[PDB]
Symmetry: C3
Subunit: 114 residues, 3 copies
């Protein structure tokens, strides 16, 4: 799986250990092996949500399966919880796009997962 | 809806008000309330378009519906127009990927839109 | 086609002709004129792969067609090759998400490709 967060929160407000926490929590939530979990945080962005520049985030979670109605609800609770707790972003100022990737459309280690 | 722009144009060339203008104009174009519109502008990027470094932009618009043949043509005219007028980017050096997102695949406020 | 690389490798480690190399190699691989190829490299990122902050990359290739099982395997070999050779990223620490875009969903030059 791959989780990306873009946010206008400044770099200094990202606590140490945030990438590790995201990695461990995503392995717990997705059931995917932790060795395959990638995480990416992009602070200091020029963004607005509903016309306002208060803290917000635009995120993506890609996975080969483990995507669906109930699962996404659970990932959203988890990830909004983390963004609230660690980055002080309101959950109603966060969007997360979920992608169920086909194995044939994910390249890794000179090949694909197909 | 979510609009993201990545460009090699420098930060200083993004004018005051650009995020707010995108927000208002996307609310109009998509027929969605502005409170639901998120915008994200990323200047200073290392990018080329057609094997040259002149101004260009790589963009994404994600929306739960309001995506389709005619509507996307209309968004492209609108958005290329804004990128030309405000950032001085030639419309023939802009790509916009459109994504019709399923409500179950968009997280917000600790759940999804499903 | 559009190829985007996000990486924790520092900017100084991206060799000066890397965007041009990517452009020429992708034109060759995809069979498309280089004028249609856009390339975008984002160094100095806060990211981890498998919990580790050793060099890694999270990438995307979008194309209207020229995407599929065999082709994506070939692109993955090519692109992991290039990242290993030029950025010193291990191929087992690179993800490339492939997107076969519908022409109606790609904006360009005030319209779409439809």
């Amino acid at each position: 799986p791959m989780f990306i967060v873009n946010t206008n929160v400044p770099r200094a407000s990202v606590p140490d250990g945030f990438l590790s926490e995201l990695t461990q929590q995503l392995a717990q939530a997705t059931g995917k092996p932790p060795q395959y979990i990638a995480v990416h945080v992009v602070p200091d962005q020029l963004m607005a949500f509903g016309g306002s520049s208060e803290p917000c985030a635009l995120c993506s979670l890609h996975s080969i399966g483990a995507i669906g109605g109930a699962q996404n609800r659970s990932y959203s609770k988890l990830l909004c919880g983390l963004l609230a707790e660690r980055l002080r972003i309101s959950p109603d100022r966060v969007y997360i796009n979920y992608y169920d990737m086909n194995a044939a459309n994910v390249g890794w280690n000179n090949s694909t997962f197909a």
